[PDB]
Design an enzyme around this catalytic site. Structure first.
Site, PDB file in Angstrom:
ATOM      1  N   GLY A   8       0.788  -1.235   0.000  1.00 49.78           N
ATOM      2  CA  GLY A   8       0.000   0.000   0.000  1.00 49.78           C
ATOM      3  C   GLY A   8       0.817   1.280   0.000  1.00 49.78           C
ATOM      4  N   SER A  63       5.265  -5.829  -1.991  1.00 52.31           N
ATOM      5  CA  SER A  63       5.645  -4.415  -1.933  1.00 52.31           C
ATOM      6  C   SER A  63       6.005  -4.006  -0.514  1.00 52.31           C
ATOM      7  CB  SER A  63       4.530  -3.520  -2.478  1.00 52.31           C
ATOM      8  OG  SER A  63       4.104  -3.980  -3.741  1.00 52.31           O
ATOM      9  N   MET A  64       5.193  -3.132   0.066  1.00 55.11           N
ATOM     10  CA  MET A  64       5.458  -2.640   1.405  1.00 55.11           C
ATOM     11  C   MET A  64       5.318  -3.740   2.455  1.00 55.11           C
ATOM     12  SD  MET A  64       6.729   0.289   1.774  1.00 55.11           S
ATOM     13  CE  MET A  64       7.507   1.107   3.158  1.00 55.11           C
ATOM     14  N   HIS A  89       8.570  -6.364  -5.816  1.00 53.55           N
ATOM     15  CA  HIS A  89       8.095  -5.226  -6.612  1.00 53.55           C
ATOM     16  C   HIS A  89       7.475  -4.097  -5.828  1.00 53.55           C
ATOM     17  CE1 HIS A  89       6.886  -3.192 -10.287  1.00 53.55           C
ATOM     18  NE2 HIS A  89       5.593  -3.212  -9.920  1.00 53.55           N
ATOM     19  N   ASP A 119       8.134  -7.286 -11.819  1.00 57.55           N
ATOM     20  CA  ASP A 119       7.232  -8.290 -11.265  1.00 57.55           C
ATOM     21  C   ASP A 119       7.910  -9.644 -11.202  1.00 57.55           C
ATOM     22  OD1 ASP A 119       5.085  -6.576 -10.870  1.00 57.55           O
ATOM     23  OD2 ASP A 119       4.076  -7.135 -12.741  1.00 57.55           O
TER      24      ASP A 119
END
Lengths: 184, 184, 184, 184, 184, 184, 184, 184, 184, 184, 184
Positions: free
Chosen positions: E60, E89-90, E114, E163
């Site tokens: 996010g 991600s995060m 990613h 990705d």
């Protein structure tokens, strides 16, 4: 937000312990039943002590109002009415319905006696019945108002069928309230 | 807003403690289930003590009302009914269904005997079952009302099929209610 | 409004303490989960004491109701069913599924044996599996009904495939319920 | 409505005290989190006693199910799985992932092995990565299922790629579940 | 449904009592604030006992996650990270941000390195400020990852911009996590 | 507003008389069929005269694009492509598909070769087929692009699976277009 | 309402017959395609006669404006630009793009040089590609304006990055327009 | 936007003048009616001249497609079918339904033989009619396809019940199409 | 898209010149008005020439279709009906209502005789009139069907009250249509 | 879809040329205006020829119907009314208001005399005015209907106040319509 | 549906050719502009022939109607007004504003003199400007009515501020209209 007082009550619940009922919204069927219940609860608690019904309402459903009115008479306790801000239509009718000598308004309260259509003919589809019913209920509302104010019936019947604003002082002179309460 | 009395209850929960049930809305299936449970609960507490059912309902689902009706008869405790504001269709039917000599109306209550369509054929999609079923349900409701009002079937059959309002007084003369309660 | 009894309860929870389960809405997965958990809890409390399942439902998801049905059998305690208001489709199925001699309906309950489509083939896209599966689940429900009602398999299969309304008396004759309860 | 037992629990929390976890909806990230936490909690409470996981789910997000799957294996305690009503896709995969010798289903439960798309390629927009990933995840699920069921890989791979319903008995024969539980 | 354990906690609060934080959703500013508040609380209760942060998150907001990142470093207590389901991600960035020797993943967790756009320029309308900033913050994220993984900056900078899915095993070899936990 | 030229045409209709086709929106199924029809109409009109397809499109449905592509080859007339503003994904593939020596771009045209997911697996529910199909169609798109550009297949396959922007000059050097048209 | 002149044109078509193009809205892809199509058509009718493009636009998409910009350079006919009401961002860029000596603005025209964000990175999800592409497109816009205004690059890079308003006279002194038209 | 050719037609109306029908969308009942009318109209014009039906359809309503199918056979003129982009379900079925030796596909067309649920039981609510009917419709569609492809019923019955894509070449080898048209 | 033939027509209007009426949607008041006007117009043009009414309709409003039916009889010209795709309820009724010897169905038309509720009792609130009226209109439609099919009244009444699918051959046997047309 | 005859009319406009007016929807102010204008037009065209007013309407706004009624009487030409499908409330009132000896209905038409509320009291909010007005309008409609039908006032008044369906034959006997038209 | 007379007019345009304007809707600024444009046109065609303005309007915007009022006086030609259905507020005001001796009403037209609020203060936020203005404009409306009716200002001022319905006859006696037209 409605704050929560610990003696845990909501602010209105706490006021209810001091025998105060706030009618501060349009009178629909959920509102009526909440008022009625409160009047039933208080009278069961102590039927000797007075009850204080503060009215700030633009009006609403006529049958819902009549349910509050009937419960005001049903209960043994004297029901005092205090109009604040605005009492229009069924709100003003409920104000006038307070116990004799105990109907009040705060100095800057708007008061409108006019009782408009409001859908008093429930779910009637036929013209003949629906029109004639709302005249009957119109007529027996004007009668209860003539009695409570001491105004001749015909004056009441004329005044509740027109947009007309009143100050607390004019309302006192009219007989809708007994006195203006400024302090205490 | 529903006030919260502490002895913590909501206002209706406290009224339930005095054996008072408040039916104040359209009778959908949530309402019917809630009422039935209140009656079941009350009967379990004290079978020998009367139950006071206040009616202010425009009506609603026929099978839902019929569930309340049957439960009123199921319980051992007598179920008094008090009509206020409006009792129409299934509202007025449940009102007449109160215990012998214990059906009441407040002085200004509106009563409508008319019982309309209501979706009595549940989820049926076939014409010769649905139409026949709604005549069968209409007939058996007429029959119950004739029994409860003392009126001949023919009179009920004629009256429930049209929009007519009654004062609480006319309701008494009809056999719908036993008395008008005004005070106490 | 759901009232909140104190002995902190809500009304259905108070009834649950008396082994009463209220099934009063369309049967979906949430309802199914709820009822099952209620049955699982009551059986763990006292496996010797009966459970009272009140039914007022238009029906719903077949697999959801089947979870209920299987749990009604899984438990050690006898599960009595009392149909009220309406018992249609899965509702009428779970009614008949109640313990022997202990399946009841209130005098004015509407009963529909018809079990329509529903969506028994979950999320299947292939016609061959989906159409064959709903016939398999149709047959397997017709069988359970024939065993419980005593009616010959071919009759049940004819009657569950069409829109059909039954009174409490007709449902007793047919073998859906054991008795009609009026009082107590 | 979710009922509230007083020992103040809701119904699911009361079952949680008897080590029962109810999984009764589509497996998304919220549901997964709830289930993982319930497992983490029960294992820390008493790692030597069994956990009962009731499964009634249409399935859902693959990484969500795979989180529950991992936790089931992570905890010290045997996780027993009971399939009721419907266990499809992720639901059925989790049912098979229960402790050896302790995977059950109620007699009328529907089981679906078919494991569809399910958004396994997360937030990937590159074609070659998303497609090869979903084939890799699809491969490692089939492998896990071959090991649990004892069916040949090529058999599982054929069945997880097509719509197909199984009765509780067929699931037993297949190796998905160890036994059907009918009573007790 | 979030079950409510009585020792009267909700399930996550009960876990919080055993020093466990569940980050199982998209990281926005509300979630950030809640996780931060949980870390702050746990450190203030006992600075010496470890904290267990479970990660199942698609990721996010960059500045939200970075708030969690800084607080993880701010607290005295060692923050262990356990990746389950999906750490993307995060989510993956927080997983690697765990305490040395104390970063884990369950065998079937999907990891995505990613880190895409994610609105890192707040509400900067100016082009040369917004673009240069996201480059700057991307640079400092790559730098932090390079140190935690032991990978060369250039490899991290290349892998964070594409990705690619990693298994738990690949993630261990890469330096993202320290070990794959299956049991206990 | 789209103006109406009298020779009564809309502006595009007038351009169609001069053999110009404007592809200026996302390529969905309605757009494809409009393009295809125009190419069919023009070739029936005069199969010797060239056709001018101006492309300003962010891309779209892969099967819809392939339909335009196939009709470009089907028709006898040489189809010239002029990229303006933006040609991304299927738009850039259609640009490259223009007749040899007759693929152009205006100096400031954005060009993105990257072809993302786009839903090439139609309405497939099964994982095995849906993933493998989109690799096949990925593969035969890379092949047509390798041929048209003269780039080795592997370079194409790598470049169309990453976000990559090109100026008209770089596109010329890449072999995507034959020349940059500034004037005439 | 857009009126319909007969000679049967709408008002814009009637103006197009006198080589006048009205660009009076935000510059998205629909509008761009429409302006591009009007220029192509007008240059087709008579490539020697001038084209008048009136600009009243808040701005819009960059690639869309770039399309119009290129088409303006592509056509043989001189494109005179006139700014009326408002020319901002892409609107002001197009105003300066008009033929040498033939850029005009009415006396009370607001001209905003600021060329903002406006999603110049299509749908690129990679940070380093999207960030570096928008800087590239920002620089090549500054270069074009430096060329059209005669202003040094550094003056343009600084001005197009902040909001400022210009009167017609200031735009002329700046080199944005060649003259203020007042009469005739 | 649909261009308007003048000889005034829309682009499809002009293509109809060359006996070309464009089926380029889902087959709902509007589409089916439009197509049927185009075929009826064309047959009335010249019964001895072939009709060219271009298919680019994801499929749709089964009875709708069947209306087109029957009309294709009803008319005296031979109906050639040309598949482009995608022909799936009812799209692919109408494609095979083209006249003998006159079914075609463009080199890159995607063909899916799978024919799913589709709502084939119209407005039926009874299980034993609907399920049986959808098997009856599935069987008679298999039978038609077997006739048109030359394939044994068993092969069609197996193939139409699963998701499989075909290249235009595989479609030719299957008996689905007569040839791949590449040029002219 | 509805194509616009020139001889200015749309496709159905061109068919109307050949005395073909397309009834291809659910029958409501707009559809009914349309068809009636078409029949009224054609009869005024040439009362000697037949009219061709193509039917593809799921049914609809009974009174609307009855307007059509009455107008089919009112006109001097013979009205042939050709059922295609689906002819259900009112659709199947109007099909049978066609002139003697001139009622047809295409070989793969689905035919449903079932006429469900619809809402034949307009805006009636009274049960007694509404339920009796739908039986009266049911009986009066059963009669018209018995006359047209030759089937005994009691059979038609049994078959129109249940969900029933017929092939074109079955409908010929039953007397719904006179013949199945395949060609010409 | 409304078809377009070329003599360029739509279907209704072609019928308008043969003096036929189609009233086929709820009578609101738009519909009234349309009908009044059509009457005004036909009367001015030729005042000596009859006008044919087909009526298929559920009814509507009373002042809207009363405008059509007034115009029907206002024009010189005889306005013939044909009732088809359904003529209820205002629809039926307008059907009866047709030229003496020239009011008809098709054999299966449904007629409803019942004239309900209809918002006759416009924008009046005063109780006494709105109720007495609707009784006055209700009275003058009954009077008009008594005169047209030749039924006693007390008979009409009874029927316009209740739901009630009439067949075309009953309407003839009642005096609503002069004859049933079956053919020609 | 607005039918389209060919002499190719729409029905109102055909009426406009005979100098007839139909004001049959709520008067807002769009309607105002259209009526004004119609009066302007008609006066410019022939200043000597009368204009016939038909009024069926609930009223609306005060400044909109006043635009119509002024233009009616501005034009040279006498404007006759014919009230049908409902002429209320600004509708009734325009009716009386008709030419002397030339104001009519059809026998059953409802006239309401009542001119309510109607937002006559535009967007004035200031209290003392908005209130004083509506008094001023109310005064000048009363003044214009007093002159057109011949009534004393004080009677007009009293009657315009109350809900009262007038018949055509009462309106004639009052001076609102000159005559009631029944025929010709």
């Amino acid at each position: 937000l409605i704050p929560t007082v610990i003696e845990a009550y909501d602010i209105y619940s706490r006021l209810l312990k001091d025998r105060i009922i706030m009618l501060g919204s349009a009178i629909d069927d959920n509102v009526a039943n909440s008022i009625v219940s409160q009047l039933l609860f208080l009278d069961a608690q102590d039927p000797e002590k007075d009850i204080f019904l503060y009215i700030n309402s633009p009006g609403g459903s006529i049958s819902a109002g009549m349910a509050i009115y009937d419960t005001m008479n049903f209960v043994k306790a004297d029901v005092q009415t205090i109009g604040m801000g605005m009492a229009a239509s069924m709100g003003s009718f409920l104000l006038t319905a307070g116990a004799n000598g105990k109907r009040f308004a705060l100095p800057n309260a708007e008061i409108m006696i006019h009782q408009p259509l409001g859908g008093a003919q429930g779910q009637a589809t036929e013209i003949e019945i629906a029109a004639r019913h709302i005249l009957k209920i119109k007529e027996r509302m004007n009668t209860i108002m003539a009695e409570k104010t001491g105004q001749p019936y015909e004056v009441i019947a004329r005044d509740t069928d027109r947009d007309n604003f009143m100050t607390a002082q004019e309302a006192k002179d009219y007989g809708l309230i007994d006195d203006i309460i400024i302090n205490k």
